[PDB]
């Protein structure tokens, strides 16, 4: 149980944060990546939305049978692919999604396509305010209005909880990541210390259990790029990649975090029942650590 | 960290205990249980030698591999069919083992035959004395000189975590279990709280952490049984099974317990390869504690 009072924020009938056992594990499934074959050109956006559908209904079908409730993780390489992308998510889902790319150029041209819209304001998570934001993308992000964003800790200059922590609250010359966000109008905070490699997701976790214990706001992580550069596992095959890519990804939830990104949405199947296993435990203990399920739509009450 | 001293045991090399990220868990592999396709008749001890063989082989495989040491736990029907089986697994591996049986006066028989041999004292863990324990039980164990047992600090009328200090140290006019067990020459305890189902398996994790920090004697469980009953996951298939399955055993780990049955020998490959990633995790964060490793044999420093 945390220090801190936690901060539960409602994304569009999306629970996220509380203590461990409040509400269930939030999962965010990553579409169009690199190397997603149902992109047949990444440059220009475009895509089998058969195929994105088919995973967009099986993420929902998974979510009804667990509890789980689902963030989607859009990625994009290109301003025009990613705009049509985000289009096409709004239109096809309900659900809250996170604007991503590796290029703030990226993140900030989409933005500035898709305008003043209460649905994005509702429904588009700024994937990320990180180490590298500048005052244009702050600019960008106000200008859309954006409430809620990642803040991403992901830093090699920054390998220790504490280190991550301070570059979170802002140290000597530097504001912090946080006050960054609160500049763009950011008003709510997911919070992704980062993973640097599968061992350090334990550093991860230590992060997200800081972050919650003295500011309260959801902290989760996304180990998938982490799972599928460890050779050694990987090369075992089906069912050994995915048991040790299960240990990984449900490795924070046990240490109380509220969010996993757990990779290309395909893995969704065995994510969710992995996932769903680990908060049923947790949310059983909530008389021993005095917390109140905040829903009767949890594993808990679901997945037996 | 746990306040009291760990009692860390060497049974026949085999470390079990110490405080988080000190020791790798200790897995403890379930052969010639009731329906194992390996039996043919389970009163006789009927059972095929080179499959025996072959699960053993795995196991020292698996256990070179990762690091994570083993435990075989023997079951048995009748005092033939056990008699049986220990003499093979004395015969086919170093491991220690679990005398194990639904029936006490299986084990109280087996123990008869097997005799106060040295190789028993040192290799023979008496799984376990229970509330239900009789004289007739802690003689057989004094008459064959066994050294180490299973404690199943379990009570049906005793769920809080807390309450088994009362089951351990007495209450009342009850003798504790580590009372009954010593009054046996017992001088090394195994503490297994016990599991109800797969979501009380976060009860049974606080309970070992409860023992670990005011007795500080190894703890581990047992939730293999709750995982198999629970038919809506083990009719999915893989890797879904495995995931869930590895979600459940990996749990009690990351909580600080010590070791693991995690059912029939078959699951090893998947068990292993999960459990190794959650053991190599706990101790990257002995980077931050300055907890020392106890063994260079550590899933950390072998699976990457």
Request: aromatic share 10%; with cysteine; glycine share 8%.
């Given at each position: ?6 901060h ?15 509400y ?60 049509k992308?985000?289009?096409?998510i ?11 790319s590796?290029s ?121 790029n ?29 240490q ?35 917390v ?10 679901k997945?037996?």
């Amino acid at each position: 149980k945390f220090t801190a009072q936690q901060h539960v924020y409602d994304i569009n009938g999306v629970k996220v944060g509380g203590q461990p056992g409040e509400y269930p594990t939030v999962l965010i499934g990553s579409i169009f990546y690199r190397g997603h074959k149902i992109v047949s050109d990444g440059q220009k956006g475009i895509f089998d939305k058969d195929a994105a559908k088919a995973l967009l209904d099986q993420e929902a079908e998974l979510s009804a049978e667990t509890g789980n409730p689902f963030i989607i993780d859009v990625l994009g390489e290109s301003v025009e692919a990613l705009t049509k992308y985000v289009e096409f998510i709004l239109e096809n889902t309900t659900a809250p999604f996170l604007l991503d790319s590796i290029s703030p150029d990226v993140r900030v041209g989409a933005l500035k396509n898709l305008g003043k819209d209460p649905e994005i304001q509702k429904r588009l998570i700024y994937n990320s305010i990180e180490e590298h934001y500048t005052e244009e993308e702050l600019a960008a992000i106000k200008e859309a209005g954006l409430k809620t964003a990642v803040i991403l800790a992901f830093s090699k200059k920054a390998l220790k909880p504490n280190a991550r922590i301070d570059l979170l609250q802002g140290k000597d010359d530097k504001e912090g990541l946080i006050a960054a966000a609160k500049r763009a109008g950011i008003e709510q905070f997911l919070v992704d210390p980062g993973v640097l490699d599968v061992a350090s997701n334990s550093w991860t976790t230590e992060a997200i259990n800081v972050v919650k214990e003295q500011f309260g706001y959801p902290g989760g992580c996304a180990p998938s790029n982490a799972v599928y550069l460890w050779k050694k596992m990987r090369s075992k095959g089906t069912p050994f990649f995915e048991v040790a890519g299960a240990a990984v990804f449900t490795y924070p939830i046990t240490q109380g975090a509220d969010f996993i990104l757990y990779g290309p949405m395909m893995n969704a199947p065995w994510v969710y029942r992995a996932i769903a296993t680990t908060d049923a435990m947790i949310a059983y203990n909530n008389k021993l650590t005095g917390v109140k399920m905040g829903t009767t739509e949890h594993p808990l009450l679901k997945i037996f």
